[PDB]
Amino acid sequence: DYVLYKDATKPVEDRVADLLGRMTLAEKIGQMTQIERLVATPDVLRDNFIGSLLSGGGSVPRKGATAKEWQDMVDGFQKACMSTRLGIPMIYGIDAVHGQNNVYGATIFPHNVGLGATRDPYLVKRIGEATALEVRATGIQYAFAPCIAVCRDPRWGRCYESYSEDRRIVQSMTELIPGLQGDVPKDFTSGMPFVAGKNKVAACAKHFVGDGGTVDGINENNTIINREGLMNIHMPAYKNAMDKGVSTVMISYSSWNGVKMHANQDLVTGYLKDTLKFKGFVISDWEGIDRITTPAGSDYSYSVKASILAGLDMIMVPNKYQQFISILTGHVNGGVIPMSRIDDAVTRILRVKFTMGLFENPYADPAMAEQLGKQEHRDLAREAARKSLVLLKNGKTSTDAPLLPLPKKAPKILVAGSHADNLGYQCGGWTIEWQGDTGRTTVGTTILEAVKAAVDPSTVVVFAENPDAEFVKSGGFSYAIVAVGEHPYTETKGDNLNLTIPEPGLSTVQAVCGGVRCATVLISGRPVVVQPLLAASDALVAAWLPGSEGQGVTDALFGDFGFTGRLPRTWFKSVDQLPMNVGDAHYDPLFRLGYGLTTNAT
Ligand SMILES: *[C@@H]1O[C@H](CO)[C@@H](O[C@@H]2O[C@H](CO)[C@@H](O[C@@H]3O[C@H](CO[C@H]4O[C@H](CO)[C@@H](O)[C@H](O)[C@@H]4O[C@@H]4O[C@H](CO)[C@@H](O)[C@H](O)[C@H]4NC(C)=O)[C@@H](O)[C@H](O)[C@@H]3O)[C@H](O)[C@H]2NC(C)=O)[C@H](O[C@H]2O[C@@H](C)[C@@H](O)[C@@H](O)[C@@H]2O)[C@H]1NC(C)=O
Ligand SMILES: *[C@@H]1O[C@H](CO)[C@@H](O[C@@H]2O[C@H](CO)[C@@H](O[C@@H]3O[C@H](CO)[C@@H](O)[C@H](O)[C@@H]3O)[C@H](O)[C@H]2NC(C)=O)[C@H](O)[C@H]1NC(C)=O
Ligand SMILES: *[C@@H]1O[C@H](CO)[C@@H](O)[C@H](O)[C@H]1NC(C)=O
Ligand SMILES: *[C@H]1O[C@H](CO)[C@@H](O)[C@H](O)[C@H]1F
């Protein structure tokens, strides 16, 4: 007879109910499982009724794969899932946090902290639009973004994934969501999930909640603060995500007053679902439930019980799916977890899939392949990079002539530094590899390349990664552009207590600047000790992690556009002042939040 859930002209809620009512326990728990592509097989997917797959940092078909290669991979997995008794399409997720960054050739946009310095939510929205297209260009339909954490301690290795230390700024940047999913209708109810269609992707507000508030910025640690600050600082942005229809929400590895988020039923179910009225689905983080216990995974049985009863709907296993499914099944069979919990979880996952049209368009669109790395997207990225630059100094003294903008026509100029010609460094974490990488790992333009592409034909451009003082003094340079900074990092590998840039760095700047007037470009994912660098430089620009379009940097250095970016964080004088955020008690910043020198286009 007629099958309601397969009828596209029917309301989403009716389709969810109809399908849910035909599912076996195995099929229900299957929808709740998300596995890594590395352990997926047509059989595994079909036999276990897997509801979702993901690609972790660096998890790719093969180095340098094309958009078609990705599309074929995703489609392959989808066909297996479509072959099940109910034919429920799987939703493939990935970390497209500053472009479709795992993919070779994808446009790499500036990381969040930089986007916060632009104070342009519309720009960010546009970035989200370009990003969805490039993700769909690879056949993926779900992006684990935006990370709306409010980093309150720069020592956190994920601070660069935070728009600001000021919730107000982070709230405004939730505009990435409508960019990724598309704008919600005017009638729209806050809390409901939404995705315009096959040319958009499901978004993910992460990490619920207070991930940007761990002590000493220690990742995945404990966030000690009253519900007053929790709700005043780290919660706001989520309410905005609810109003903009964010499809999913990922839970943080961190704890709140000693309680693991992945086990906090009060927050996940009591607040996020019951209070905020979130209707989409709640997903876990990579082995998030394993880490509920300590040692991690030392009681997976407990992990499944706590997490599921806490309110999570989909678990990012992402490897031992057999163990996960076996255990969750046992708990249900034993009454430890009620069918209502399972039904609710499956209701939310299906709601999201139906809403985004997954049942209508389960497969990738070849026509979308060209979206990957499309020049327009790169131009957009270029604009964002330019706008994210924060000029901190532009002259050694009040009477010095401002060094920036530099002249495009000069007899001979020096470009130097470890970061002057290193595309990987310039992109930072979450680029090709999980931890990011060094060198030419994808398509883009380094600062050196951008310089050469900007100067007048007559301007001789010399490159020296680490020239000594004499080399500079004898080179007859008119000026020099020196780029230095942090190395790529992600999550815990990024935790840093001293926050000083690696060498050679300061030394190169001092050597170069000692010999000729210099413009130092600082590449970092957060504010770092900068008095020494400042002392030696004539002009110093905070470029954060620009992305693949380095010309965004030269667009400002040479005056095609004036600097407009403003510090989205507090620049400290010393690390032992930390934490220290705007509105604090002893606020004694080297540069207060909102600071930024300007220039006008020549
Ligand atoms: C402040 O505290 C942080 C850590 O909390 C410290 O930086 C970390 O230092 C760790 C060791 O002390 C280091 O861990 C080791 O890493 C070795 C390999 O490290 C290279 O490769 C990784 C990526 O694979 C990069 O992230 C590293 O930065 C490093 O990269 C090379 O760095 C050199 C020097 O600038 C450069 O010339 C190379 O071109 C560059 N190559 C690459 C890959 O790009 C590994 O073999 C060890 O087993 C061990 O795991 C950890 O990676 C690093 N954290 C990061 C992400 O930077 C700060 O500074 C230290 O930096 C290291 C590199 C070294 O210079 C130390 O002398 C510095 O103290 C701390 N600052 C201070 C003042 O203590
Ligand atoms: C926040 O981070 C701190 C680390 O600074 C966590 O505390 C630390 O916990 C680890 C283990 O959980 C302890 O290390 C050692 O682990 C081995 C494991 O085999 C064990 O054999 C040793 O006896 C020892 O426990 C470490 O001592 C401890 N350090 C601190 C800070 O006291 C803390 O648990 C984290 N908070 C949360 C819940 O996120
Ligand atoms: C120069 O830049 C400032 C701020 O960046 C701006 O307010 C001002 O209008 C600009 N001047 C001109 C003439 O465009
Ligand atoms: C855990 O893993 C997921 C998927 O790779 C990331 O999106 C989270 O930020 C990380 F904490």
494 CA distance to ligand 2 centroid (A)? 18
Residue 17 CA to residue 350 CA, distance in Å, equals: 9
Is ligand 3 within 6 A of the CB of residue 226? no
> Is residue 25 domain-shared with residue 90, that is, in the same domain?
yes
Closest ligand to C-alpha of residue 564 is 3
Residue 398 lies in a domain: yes
Query: What is the token pair recorded at 194?
Result: 């939404």
Residue 543 lies in a domain: yes
The C-alpha angle with vertex 313 and arms to 308 and 317, in degrees rounded to 5, equals: 80
Closest ligand to C-alpha of residue 55 is 4
Residue 467 CA to residue 131 CA, distance in Å, equals: 39
Side-chain-side CA neighbours of residue 36 (13 Å): 15
Residue 591 CA to residue 595 CA, distance in Å, equals: 6
Residue 599 lies in a domain: no
How many structural domains comprise the chain?
A: 2
> Is residue 334 domain-shared with residue 185, that is, in the same domain?
yes
154 CA distance to ligand 2 centroid (A)? 22
Neighbours of 10 (CB within 10 A): 13
> Is residue 267 domain-shared with residue 401, that is, in the same domain?
no
> Is residue 548 domain-shared with residue 449, that is, in the same domain?
yes
> Is residue 114 domain-shared with residue 6, that is, in the same domain?
yes
Domain boundary, last residue among 318, 348, 373: 373
599 CA distance to ligand 3 centroid (A)? 7
Cβ contact 507:536 at 8 Å? no
218 CA distance to ligand 2 centroid (A)? 12
Domain boundary, last residue among 320, 346, 373: 373
Residue 528 lies in a domain: yes
Q: Which residues contact 456 (CB under 8 A, 6 or more apart)?
A: 408, 409, 410
> Is residue 214 domain-shared with residue 284, that is, in the same domain?
yes
397 CA distance to ligand 3 centroid (A)? 22
Output the residue whose Cα is nearest ligand 4's atom 8: 285
Short-list 255, 115, 205, CA closest to 544: 115
484 CA distance to ligand 1 centroid (A)? 14
Residue 518 lies in a domain: yes
285 CA distance to ligand 4 centroid (A)? 5
H helices of 52-175, in order, are 67-82, 112-118, 121-136, 167-172
Pairing of strands 222-223, 204-208: unpaired
Cβ contact 81:62 at 8 Å? no
> Is residue 69 domain-shared with residue 107, that is, in the same domain?
yes
Residue 590 lies in a domain: no
Residue 33 DSSP SS3: strand
> Is residue 24 domain-shared with residue 95, that is, in the same domain?
yes
> Is residue 333 domain-shared with residue 357, that is, in the same domain?
yes
Output the residue whose Cα is nearest ligand 2's atom 33: 221
Residue 599 DSSP SS3: coil
Closest ligand to C-alpha of residue 422 is 1
Cβ contact 77:68 at 8 Å? no
Q: Which amino acid is at 130?
A: A
Neighbours of 332 (CB within 10 A): 18
Residue 415 DSSP SS3: strand
452-459's contacts with Cβ under 8 Å and 24+ in sequence apart are: 453/551, 453/554, 454/408, 454/551, 454/554, 454/558, 454/560, 455/408, 455/409, 455/410, 455/413, 455/558, 456/408, 456/409, 456/410, 458/409, 458/411, 459/408, 459/409, 459/410, 459/411, 459/412, 459/413
Short-list 299, 200, 211, CA closest to 249: 211
Cβ contact 18:4 at 8 Å? yes
361: phi > 0 → left, psi -120 to 50 → alpha, else beta; which?
A: beta
> Is residue 379 domain-shared with residue 353, that is, in the same domain?
no
Cβ contact 181:202 at 8 Å? yes
Output the residue whose Cα is nearest ligand 1's atom 50: 493
Residue 75 lies in a domain: yes
> Is residue 118 domain-shared with residue 154, that is, in the same domain?
yes
Cβ contact 525:545 at 8 Å? yes
- From the CA of 563, give the closest atom in ligand 3: 5
Is ligand 4 within 6 A of the CB of residue 430? no
Cβ contact 511:469 at 8 Å? yes
Q: Which amino acid is at 271?
A: Y
- Resolution in Å equals 2.5
Euclidean distance between the first and the last CA atom of the chain, given in angstroms as a whole number: 72
> What are the residue numbers of the active site?
285, 491
For tokens 């790395």, name the residue. 373
Technique used by the depositors: X-ray
**Residue 502: CATH number of its domain:** 3.40.50.1700
Residue 316 CA to residue 353 CA, distance in Å, equals: 17
**Residue 103: CATH number of its domain:** 3.20.20.300
Q: Distance of alpha carbon 16 from its chain centroid, rounded?
A: 31
> CA 10, 16, 18, 23: dihedral to nearest 10 degrees?
150
> What DSSP string runs through 249-294?
EEEPSSEETTEEGGG-HIIIIIIIIIIS---SEEE--TTTTGGGSS
Short-list 366, 363, 360, 372, CA closest to 75: 363
Is ligand 3 within 6 A of the CB of residue 599? no
Is ligand 3 within 6 A of the CB of residue 602? no
CA distances, 475 to each of 407, 450, 464, 513 (Å): 18, 21, 11, 13
Is ligand 1 within 6 A of the CB of residue 496? yes
Residue 543 CA to residue 553 CA, distance in Å, equals: 7
Neighbours of 334 (CB within 10 A): 8
For tokens 């969805």, name the residue. 132
Residue 72 CA to residue 78 CA, distance in Å, equals: 10
- From the CA of 158, give the closest atom in ligand 4: 9
Short-list 150, 218, 562, 552, CA closest to 394: 562
Is ligand 2 within 6 A of the CB of residue 252? no
Sheet holding 412-416, edge to edge: 390-394, 539-544, 518-523, 480-485, 412-416, 460-464
Residue 357 lies in a domain: yes
Cβ contact 466:416 at 8 Å? yes
Output the residue whose Cα is nearest ligand 2's atom 7: 221
> Is residue 433 domain-shared with residue 452, that is, in the same domain?
yes
| Test site for ligand 2: of 211, 214, 222, 253, most ligand atoms within 8 A of the Cβ | 222
Pairing of strands 259-260, 255-256: antiparallel
Domain boundary, last residue among 335, 355, 373: 373
Range of the domain at 93: 1-373
Cβ contact 418:489 at 8 Å? no
Strand partners, 540: 393, 520
Is ligand 3 within 6 A of the CB of residue 294? no
Neighbours of 548 (CB within 10 A): 29
Residue 49 CA to residue 407 CA, distance in Å, equals: 62
Q: Annotate 517-557 with three-state secondary structure.
A: CEEEEEECCCCCCCHHHHHHCCEEEEEECCCCECHHHHHHH
Output the residue whose Cα is nearest ligand 1's atom 57: 487
